[PDB]
């Protein structure tokens, strides 16, 4: 799951930690290899700063990943709850 | 279906007859020397009682018009009892006293609207006086004395109430339930209370108090509008196992699902009650979130992408006890962790600091107080259960009385406060002749309760009333011993709120009934 693409995206995020779209891309790639804890943690960290991060793409991606993990997933459940508390 | 109509004088006499029957039935039980009333039942021995409420609940006459009159005075009178906690009989007596005089005056040719205006003016002046005459009751010792007096001379209940109220504070919530045997305990747990009643009757399972109580039930949060019971089946079945009741808080439930739940809970299988969420707007969602944090359940909101088939048994909330009155709801001792509560408090605290308007700041102050406050529980034990249940009833009554008292203060009771007020207002005048007549009618009707109380004890009313007017201050008459003196020292007193409420509500209904013109009803 330590793919070269994820490695280069990780280096780029480390160089520009405030870039929400870059982190969103890295989170999508992390999710696509099953590294969902890291991806959701990154996306939520960006959402806590700004709900409209990456012009709303950060949220979308986030929610989409949750939808991909299904309702039976404990990690998603948790985040789901947090998300609501953050949003409203 | 064919109707029947009656105009004017012909209608008024009938309505008068109906109110007369209701008043005569209720008013003998007034005071400390009250007589008895015998109520029949279908099965077994009759019932003998000395209480106004139970007698009033039963009466309904034969002829249609008179029954309408009685029902109309009855509905108004009940609200004072619901609002303050005492005084149905007093309201009924005052209503009769005003209506009789008013109708006699109207038959002699004066205008009705003038009488209406006069009566309202007199009532407002009297309320001003009544606030002026009162005396405060704020310190703990006075709290204890008031509680003791209201509970028929038992220091134990009074001091217990006082110490608990000190424990939680004057704004807190106090609840009473059974204990484990002949020792008193009091404790603090995590709780909640808000203003929403049950969505429908027939949820009652304990008729004595007209309330619903459930122990260790399940709780379901709904941020949507539900009218079709179809999507409720999976969660209902998952709750059907393990034999636990269920509580549904949503925005509203209409029609099919409502009736189906009514039938299901009324035929035994399954236990469910449902109510609306507090408030409206986005704050409604915020309060749902807060309750969720407290209970550790799941909020089901469509916008984020939930649906009803989507929930499992883990998602629901679970707690110690729930109580539902007619218009108040209380949650006792859920499961939440301290960490989540503390973080919730921190977030709402900073949002307070972030506020840009006084309105939102005050609302958020409400929310933090409600959450990070608390609840208190009282457990009483008495060794031979019968005494235990009796004591529990007395404690509940004392609690209501003390709350009402600390709200607004107390005044010399037993019926003298009203006569003192009405004696201080001999000067009041109006615009023309008719308003003067109206004022006189209200003032002369304010004397009824004391005349009745004296009449039951086999004395002569007019002499006692005259002597009580003669003096000043709190100097009054004690029915239990036949003595004059300072009514505040002999331990007879009442909260201000009940007297004010009785006066206003009686005046309202009498005003409406003076100026009616037509009546329309069914055919025999």
Min Cα separation B309/chain A (Å): 11
Phi, psi of B402 (to 5 degrees): -65, -40
The rounded distance, in Å, linking the Cα atoms of B160 and B377 is 12
In chain A, which among 19-78 make CB contacts under 8 A with chain B?
Answer: 63, 67, 71
Residues B105 and B514 sit within 8 Å (Cβ to Cβ): no
Min Cα separation A67/chain B (Å): 9
- The C-alpha R_g of chain A, in whole angstroms, comes to 12
Method by which the model was determined: cryo-EM
For chains A and B, CB pairs below 8 A equal 20
User: Which domain covers residue B335, as residue numbers?
Assistant: 176-177+189-401
- Residue B286 in contact with partner chain A when CB distance is under 8 A: yes
User: Nearest 5°: CA angle at B220, between B215 and B221?
Assistant: 135
Q: What is the largest CA-CA distance in chain B?
A: 78
CB contact under 8 A, A84 and B301: yes
Residues whose CB falls within 8 Å of the CB of residue B169, separated by 6 or more in sequence, listed in order: none
Q: Which residues have C-beta within 8 Å of that of residue B372, sequence separation ≥ 6?
A: B341, B345
Closest CA to B220 of B285, B175, B272: B272
B262 neighbors B201 (Cβ within 8 angstroms): no
Residue A56 to residue A36: CA distance in whole angstroms: 20
CA dihedral in degrees (B373, B321, B266, B327; nearest 10)?
A: -20
Judging contacts by C-beta atoms under 8 Å, the chain B residues touching residue A71 are 310, 312
CATH H-level, domain A9-87: superfamily: Tetratricopeptide repeat domain (1.25.40.10)
The SS3 assignment for A36 reads helix
Query: What are residue B274's phi and psi, to 5 degrees?
Result: -140, 145
CA dist B317 and B333 (Å) reads 12
Nearest to B80 by CA among B48, B56, B116: B56
Chain B residues lying within 8 Å of A88, measured CB to CB: 282, 285-286, 289
User: Residue B253, by phi and psi: left (phi above 0), alpha (psi -120 to 50) or beta?
Assistant: beta
| Spatial contact of B146 and B393, defined as CB atoms under 8 Å apart | no
B353: domain CATH number?
3.50.7.10
Q: Looking at the partner chain, which of A63, A83, A88 has a beta carbon nearest the beta carbon of B282?
A: A88
Nearest of B225, B271, B216, B283 to residue B250 by alpha carbon: B225
- Per-residue HEC secondary structure of B224-280 comes to CEECCHHHHHHHHHHHHHHHCCEEEEECEECCHHHHHHHHHHHCCCCCEEEEECCCC
Q: Cβ of A1 under 8 Å from any chain B Cβ?
A: no
Q: Are B92 and B451 in contact (CB under 8 A)?
A: no
A67 vs B310: CB contact, 8 Å cut-off?
no
Return the number of other C-beta atoms located less than 10 Å from residue B27's C-beta.
Answer: 21
Residues 6 or more apart from B23 whose CB is under 8 A from it?
A: B92, B93, B95, B96
For residue A87, list chain B residues with Cβ-Cβ distance below 8 A: 304
On chain B, the residues whose CB falls within 8 A of the CB of A80 are 304
Identify the three-state secondary structure at position B82: helix
Question: A81, B305: Cβ pair inside 8 Å?
Answer: no
In this structure, are residues B276 and B250 in contact, taking their beta carbons and an 8 Å threshold? Answer: yes
B355 in A contact zone (CB under 8 Å): no
The rounded distance, in Å, linking the Cα atoms of B38 and A5 is: 91
Phi, psi of A35 (to 5 degrees): -90, 65
Helix (H) or strand (E) holding A42: helix A36-49
- Of the residues B234, B282, B304, B371, the best mutation for testing chain A's interface (the one with the most A CB atoms within 10 Å of its CB) is B304
Q: Is the distance from CB of B20 to CB of B26 less than 8 angstroms? A: no
CA A34 to chain CA centroid, nearest Å: 12
Q: B287 to chain A: nearest residue by CA?
A: A88
Probe site for chain B from A64, A66, A74, A85 (most B CB atoms < 10 A)? A85
Q: How far apart are CA B482 and CA B480, in angstroms?
A: 6
Long-range contacts of B176-181 (CB under 8 A, 24+ apart): B176/B377, B176/B378, B176/B380, B176/B392, B176/B395, B176/B396, B176/B399, B177/B377, B177/B378, B177/B379, B178/B379, B178/B380, B178/B388, B178/B392, B179/B379, B179/B380, B179/B381, B179/B388, B180/B379, B180/B381, B181/B381, B181/B383
Tell me how far apart the alpha carbons of residues B402 and B150 are, in angstroms, rounded to a whole number: 8
Distance of CA B448 to the CA centre of its chain: 24
Return the ∠ at Cα B28 (arms to B26 and B33), rounded to 5°: 140
């Amino acid at each position: 799951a330590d793919t070269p693409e994820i490695q280069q995206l990780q280096q780029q995020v480390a160089e520009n930690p405030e870039d929400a779209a870059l982190a969103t891309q890295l989170a999508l790639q992390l999710h696509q290899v099953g590294r969902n804890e890291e991806a959701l943690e990154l996306l939520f960290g960006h959402l806590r700063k700004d709900l409209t991060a990456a012009d709303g793409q950060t949220r979308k991606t986030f929610q989409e990943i949750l939808a991909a993990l299904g309702t039976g997933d404990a990690l998603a459940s948790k985040y789901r709850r947090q998300l609501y508390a953050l949003l409203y | 279906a064919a109707k029947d109509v009656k105009f004017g004088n012909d209608a008024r006499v009938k309505m008068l007859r109906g109110v007369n029957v209701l008043a005569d039935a209720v008013k003998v039980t007034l005071g400390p020397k009250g007589r008895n009333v015998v109520l029949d039942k279908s099965f077994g021995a009759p019932t003998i009682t000395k209480d106004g409420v139970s007698v009033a609940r039963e009466i309904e006459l034969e002829d249609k018009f008179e029954n309408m009159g009685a029902q109309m005075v009855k509905e108004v009178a009940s609200k004072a009892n619901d609002a303050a906690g005492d005084g149905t009989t007093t309201a009924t007596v005052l209503a009769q006293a005003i209506i009789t005089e008013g109708l006699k005056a109207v038959a002699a040719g004066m205008n009705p609207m003038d009488l209406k205006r006069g009566i309202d003016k007199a009532v407002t002046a009297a309320v001003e006086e009544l606030k002026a005459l009162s005396v405060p009751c704020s310190d703990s010792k006075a709290i204890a004395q008031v509680g003791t007096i209201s509970a028929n001379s038992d220091e134990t209940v009074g001091k217990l109430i006082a110490e608990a109220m000190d424990k939680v504070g004057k704004e807190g919530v106090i609840t009473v339930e059974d204990g484990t045997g002949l020792q008193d305990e009091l404790d603090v747990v995590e709780g909640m209370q808000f203003d929403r009643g049950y969505l429908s009757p027939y949820f009652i399972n304990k008729p004595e108090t007209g309330a619903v109580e459930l122990e260790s039930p399940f709780i379901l949060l709904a941020d949507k509008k539900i009218s079709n019971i179809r999507e409720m089946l999976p969660v209902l079945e998952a709750v059907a196992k393990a034999g636990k009741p269920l509580l549904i808080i949503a925005e509203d439930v209409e029609g099919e699902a409502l009736a189906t739940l009514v039938v299901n809970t009324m035929r035994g299988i399954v236990k469910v009650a449902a109510v609306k969420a507090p408030g409206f707007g986005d704050r409604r969602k915020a309060m749902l979130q807060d309750i969720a944090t407290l209970t550790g359940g799941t909020v089901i909101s469509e916008e984020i992408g939930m649906e009803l088939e989507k929930a499992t048994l883990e998602d629901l909330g679970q707690a110690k006890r729930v109580v539902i009155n007619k218009d108040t709801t209380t949650i006792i001792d859920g499961v939440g962790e301290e960490a989540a509560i503390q973080g919730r408090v921190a977030q709402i605290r900073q949002q307070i600091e972030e506020a840009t308007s006084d309105y939102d700041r005050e609302k958020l102050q409400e929310r933090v107080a409600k959450l990070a406050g608390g609840v208190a529980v009282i457990k009483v034990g008495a060794a031979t259960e019968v005494e235990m249940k009796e004591k529990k009833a007395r404690v509940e009554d004392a609690l209501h009385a003390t709350r009402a008292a600390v709200e607004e203060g107390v005044v010399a009771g037993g019926g003298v406060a009203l006569i003192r007020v009405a004696s201080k207002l001999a000067d009041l005048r109006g615009q023309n002749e008719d308003q003067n007549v109206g004022i006189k009618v209200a003032l002369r009707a304010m004397e009824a309760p004391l005349r009745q109380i004296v009449l039951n004890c086999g004395e002569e009313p007019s002499v006692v009333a005259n002597t009580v007017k003669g003096g000043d201050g709190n100097y009054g008459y004690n029915a239990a011993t036949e003595e004059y003196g300072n009514m505040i020292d002999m331990g007879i007193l009442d909260p201000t709120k009940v007297t004010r409420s009785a006066l206003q509500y009686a005046a309202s209904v009498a005003g409406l009934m003076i100026t009616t013109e037509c009546m329309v009803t069914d055919l025999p």
